Amino acid sequence: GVPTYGAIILDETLENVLLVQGYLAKSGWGFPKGKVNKEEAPHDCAAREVFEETGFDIKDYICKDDYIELRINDQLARLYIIPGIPKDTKFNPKTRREIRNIEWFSIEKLPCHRNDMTPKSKLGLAPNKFFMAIPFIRPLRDWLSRRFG
Numbered sequence: 615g616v617p618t619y620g621a622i623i624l625d626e627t628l629e630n631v632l633l634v635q636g637y638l639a640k641s642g643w644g645f646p647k648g649k650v651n652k653e654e655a656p657h658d659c660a661a662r663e664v665f666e667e668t669g670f671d672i673k674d675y676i677c678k679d680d681y682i683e684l685r686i687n688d689q690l691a692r693l694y695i696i697p698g699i700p701k702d703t704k705f706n707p708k709t710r711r712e713i714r715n716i717e718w719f720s721i722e723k724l725p726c727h728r729n730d731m732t733p734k735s736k737l738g739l740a741p742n743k744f745f746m747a748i749p750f751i752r753p754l755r756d757w758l759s760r761r762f763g
């Protein structure tokens with residue numbers, strides 16, 4: 615799979631994260647990210663996708679070693695961690711045919727797993743609108759504890 619790059623943007627309190635909501639197959643909430651182009655460096659792809667999806671340019675804030683990377687079904691997703699972005703920042707996608715909405719969410723209120731359906735004796739997981747964000751929540755919480763405390 616082609617790697618994806620993007621960002622976990624946090625505000626100044628470190629309480630909130632910026633998620634974006636797409637359409638159709640991308641209809642839920644997720645971190646801003648997208649597919650790397652031929653010959654494009656990871657940091658440039660992260661900045662490009664985030665600027666396309668949010669209108670906010672992270673290029674001056676990216677730290678090379680500060681990211682969470684996950685491999686999910688054989689596709690690598692790396693999100694650079696970008697703290698301290700004011701909550702009154704005006705975010706606007708370039709792409710509103712791709713992005714429905716852009717919101718801050720409390721990190722502590724976000725799920726870090728899906729819920730099963732053990733009440734119904736049925737296998738699998740209940741739908742959750744944060745499903746794409748979910749895999750990064752626990753690693754982010756652990757990263758913030760280690761880096762800031």
Ligand SMILES: Cn1ncc(C(=O)NCc2ccc(F)cc2)c1Cl
Nearest residue numbers: 634635636639640641643644647746
């Ligand atoms: C399968 N699937 N469901 C949700 C998402 C996703 O990425 N959600 C956020 C998003 C990121 C970039 C966008 F351009 C649009 C939306 C995916 Cl992938």
